[PDB]
Amino acid sequence: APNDRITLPPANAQRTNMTCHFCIVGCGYHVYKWPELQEGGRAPEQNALGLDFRKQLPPLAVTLTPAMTNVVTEHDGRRYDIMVVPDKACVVNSGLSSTRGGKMASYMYTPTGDGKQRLKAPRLYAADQWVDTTWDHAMALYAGLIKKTLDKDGPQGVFFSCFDHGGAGGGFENTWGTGKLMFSAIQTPMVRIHNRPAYNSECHATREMGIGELNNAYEDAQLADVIWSIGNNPYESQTNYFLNHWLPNLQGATTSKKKERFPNENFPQARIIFVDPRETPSVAIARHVAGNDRVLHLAIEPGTDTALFNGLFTYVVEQGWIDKPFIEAHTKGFDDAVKTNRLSLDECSNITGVPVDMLKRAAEWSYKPKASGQAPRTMHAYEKGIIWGNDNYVIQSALLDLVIATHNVGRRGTGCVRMGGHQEGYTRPPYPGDKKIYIDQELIKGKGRIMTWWGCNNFQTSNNAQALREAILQRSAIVKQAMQKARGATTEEMVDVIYEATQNGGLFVTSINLYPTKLAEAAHLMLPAAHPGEMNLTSMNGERRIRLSEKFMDPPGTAMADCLIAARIANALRDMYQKDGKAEMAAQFEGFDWKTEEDAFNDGFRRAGQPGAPAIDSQGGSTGHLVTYDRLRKSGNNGVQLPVVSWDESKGLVGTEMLYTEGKFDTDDGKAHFKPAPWNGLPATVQQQKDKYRFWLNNGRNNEVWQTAYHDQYNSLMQERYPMAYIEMNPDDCKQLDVTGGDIVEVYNDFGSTFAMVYPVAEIKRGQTFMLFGYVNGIQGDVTTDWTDRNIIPYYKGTWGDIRKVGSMEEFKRTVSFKSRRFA
Template sequence: MALYRREESIPLPPKNAEAYNTACQYCTVGCGYKVYVWPDGLAGGLKAGDNAFGIDFSGPQPPIVGFSYTESMHSTIRKRDGRTYHVAIVPTHDSPINPMGNHSSRGAVNAKTTWSDSRPTQARLHYPLLRSGSEFNAIPWDAAIELQARVIKGVADKHGADALCSKIYDHGGGGGGMENTYGTGRLLFTGLQMKHVGIHNRPGYSSETWGTRDRGVHELNYCYEDARLADTIMLWGSNAYVTATVFFVAHMMPNLQGATTDEKKRHYAKGEAITPARMVIVDPRISATVNAAHETGAKVLHLRPNLGTDYMLMNAVARVVWEKKYYNKNFLNQHTDMTSFEDYKKKSLELDIPYKDFMARAQKISGVPVAQIEQAAAWIAQPKPGGHPRRSLILYEKGVIWNYRQYDAVAAIAQLGALSFNIGRPGTGTGRVGGHQEGYARPDYPGPKPPPDVDKYVQDGNGKIFWLTGCNPYLAAQNNAYFRKRIGERAQALTDYLSAQKQGDGEPASIEHLAARILEGLDKTNGLFVTVQNIYMIESARDAHLILPAAQWGEAENISLNCGDRLMRLDDRFMDPPGDAKPDWEIHGLVGQKLEELYKADGKADIARRFAGMDWKHGADVVKSIQDDLYAGMNTKVPASRASTLDPESFKGVDYAYLRKIGQKGIQTPVRTDPNTGELVGTKRLYSTFYFMTKDGRFSWYGTRPWDDHASAKVVAGYLKSDRTKYPFWFTMGRDQPLWQTSYHMRHLPEKAETIPLPFVQVNPADVKKLGVTNGDIVMIYNDPCLSGCYPHPLNVGCVHSPE
């Protein structure tokens, strides 16, 4: 029996179907898509002139290059007028991101994630829900907003802002975007002045890349064109074929295959050698990206370091660059800070240690042979014939960002890029591949740097309110079993108190009385009032007291930008959200308006003013607030040579009308106003004039702490030399093509969920033999027990790997 319904045929959109532009809601790449919506009962014809695609379907499509329209790209939806509509979401051919209609397996099912009352997405939240004992009851929005506002105000007035806690996303795509990050941040940061706020994938409100930003280099500084122009592409801790599929296939792969020669001729210097790109991959396992790179026939170098030793390996590659004089002396002297450079040479390159001894130590620690380290350095930095500097694109992601000594590792790879002169020139760059798309437009975070650990703060009994928006920490927090236990205990303490009060005194007479009872319970029990704002009834909602239904991608306008190009586009609204679900910016705005009203009633006009201006009616109103609040004093009328002085994601002067006009072409941030023409102009790549984001415009160096000058180094060293009899494996996680960054939807879709019914673990074949297990066995992994399917895989002996 089939696990899910298959379609024998799907209707074509008629010529008069509504048409919208959007970008894929998922990964960092942000492929362009076209959306067509039309009423049930109508359909287009097979001839090109009879359907909205303008494609002739009367015969077979040509292989590979044909127009993609599969059953996963079609679904039916119901609008608030009660009628059923068809929706087709197909990759567009006019996007610079995914030319020729390229798309990933994630984007191919965008249509199936739309809300419908006849498909699994019917599980979406429709109305606000209030807990009563062990049940949830639907309540009107005005009641939900009043309750949230009164509880927040009561806690803040008595205990201060430190008693208010939140976890919230900071990204674009997937329901994020400029409107939502600003609307939420406007309430939390400007209005409530909260510092106990954690980002969706980390316990505090911190950047993942301070190590490069403190050097004066934003992590998104290159463009996809650079992958087409590079002599060498280095992927460090990035499984790009899986996590940025179209970036790899449509932009890196043609260069590896020698198909971008004409483009290189237009950008290279006269007489500069042009060859197909090489690829250096740094990853402990043979990933899908390694295999895909080899399939192109390109020259591929795969470095497989011991876990936790990456920053030492980065410094070793940099030492080779210095020792072999692969650097550009003019660039170093004219555009980098030579005082801090001395500290870098002493502490990171450790020039007081003879080269041979340093490299032998690096090999011993990292497990990577000296010959491979030297080859990697030559591939990314050795000048080409005629003295032309090599063009290398150095990209990193979570394998670096979530590694040992994170700040040092991110700083080390940024400095490797600067030392090898791989930044600012066509075909170069040193930055992130990316995870989510970007779309950050919040007021300044009012907390300290480094920020407090919100997860631990709440677990330890602090805080009175925990508002979870667009994230699921019951699954994603560190040591989430303990996190669930502690949050559940504190939330249940409040629930039990409210149930006892209800049994003794009856139902509260009003929302005001209920809020008063909650505030009393918080003080008497040290409980925790939990609000969850999401699109589904997620795991983190099981202990919540109030649940707020959010609108998602396609149900409200949304401005996002992809990571590599920083290409800003507008995701159109093409359907209604389920029930009375609302965008996150609107929900937070309504709470802000209620708080303004309550503080005015208290006669506290100074506090009330912090919430003024949140009466947004449309996403365009939020965009205007961004312009007025964040960009009012920003001078963007600057020449191209000073584009890198602007906030890398800023878009002063851009509105919905402009974005609709330019469509899939988009505009690359930061956006500036040309001083000569007055026109809005995007920025292809940052630091093209080598002016960096520091006070004097020079790249700032950092002396990495020595390997053994840190307490946790003993842990890593102990792993490297111990017999590991008790815990024989190091556990590493990564991302898997079918479900990564999509499971909040895909787990509801049998077409995808059945692809990987259990989490799997990859184990070196030698370890598989030693353990006596085979492919498909069910195994337990502990410290914390969990079930996984065993899958032999060629990663380092003593390591196991599982998707996150």
């Protein structure tokens, strides 16, 4: 309650390790837990922080606020203070906390806090009202429907959209549990991923070219001469990688270390290049830190990345700023790529809009040999501006070509890497189908009997989201109406009622989640899940560093770890089949005899590539068995970078810093493969929107807001600052539409209609906008198209629309700052 003090952890308070729940960087934290009616003393040796609160602390001594504290009430009814604070000795973050990780304590479950509306028990929409139901009933209904569908339609009738990521709502236990359930037991191919509408990858091209997307260390960002940030706003989206590794390089604090590693190499002041249509907070901050002369913002025309990289590739080849020995010994296809990808600087400039002098300068900084003879160490970092860009596959083809020719993989201070989104934590059986299926289109077209959203919310985050919602709400309603007729039915009769409604266009919808979410508008069944700290969980960050987040409290009510929900489902289905005398079907549901999450770790990550093991695709590789919970605990928040190379009791886990340092790539022949990258303009579907409507509807992240705001929607500070999704608009465009900060606009096109509050931004180009994605009040995705690349990767950043004033929200004008988020 009181805003002007905090309770210090006692010197002997319990302390556990926790990786941040949220973004890829995976900053390390400590959780202090102690009884509510104890506290630490201000003297440094009388509190667990070892800090002297008897007088003012200096800058950088601590990160501690009330938002980093809480009081939990456990299953035994006893109350405990918690404090969740960053670990000063963690190599990832060196004691830094983002505004998002900083709120972890506040977003732990408590009966009266921000977590108050956590799912605590199964919820059933019994035709015309939400009620609680038992887990046994829920499993009878859910497994009963799956069983009926398997028995009559086979697996093709059972649909999922499921996380494949790490951190909270993911990780190695959870991805294995769900993957084993969906792929080995049920054996359904009707599965999409949390952020993309098929069972596919963000990185098909780079992987096929032999370069897995997480190939370096965070230390490489400290060793680089030049950093490219491509389709990426890292201060906001990978905060502490940018703050703890990128900025020290720009500031000159890593120059010593470069020169120590490389005695005979010049290291100029580091420089940074951003390829982004939009001038972001990251551009502004880079210029404040390094100066204007060390930052190059290539403010390309939306969707022109391929043309940019083809023009750069062409130029470095014509200048001879490539590594010919490297290409000759370790690559295939270079000569072909030179021809297919040829594009002059003048043509490049005309397509991208970037002037020729700036294209040449980027190449000069990045690829022209240093005075000491070596090529610059240029780390090429990319994210969703090109992963959700104009033809995912082709852009990566174009970029990786430039990288391979310039030998910017496998050398320290280089890498062509994803910056990442969530943390990573994938261990799954192979996908069981032989084709890519656009799951959302299939649902819209009326296929499937049961759909489970598991740790995602595509109502807010699908492409073409309005078409999806329309269809799902309708299909859901058919089931609701069918259930309505029933009175006094057994569970088995209800299963039959619902099954029949699905033959008539219906769809049974389950959500497995922390919260009701907007999915509750269509769901029939919701199951409560547990997040890290309420469970043990393993995951890795953007340099493959695996850590254990330790359990320290109980979940709300009967919430359960997702891997144990998957075991519960499997065991229900098994029992049903055993009882029906179907031994062969029963046996498909074996191998879920799990009592704790660690069981799922042992069954999945730790079996990969082992004798007698089934086929398992794991980020841990075949040395995953060397990792145990205990060994991770002893490693601390530093963990180990995967893959593990050895272990013994005296040296602990020893891992891998950088990939591809010996020139052996993940292809048949061990070489890196160049690929053609044709420039075909924008897709027709997108070009049609652009031809009809005025504004480029760019979209993405805000620093303060995490994802679909599942926690933030309950946070009064978050809600005061961002009550509605906002749209950055050019002020001249604003005046033309007679809107200002805190007005509400409709944004629309052929695909849909949504709303935002207007946020005038001087740095936005005329005819361009930027709307917060994924949010709880004004869903941006309504106006994204259905267009996807060859692998069903959406162009989420590729849509145009018109904007119409709704009116002036005086309350937003009184409460919300519309001041500039670009620091100068």
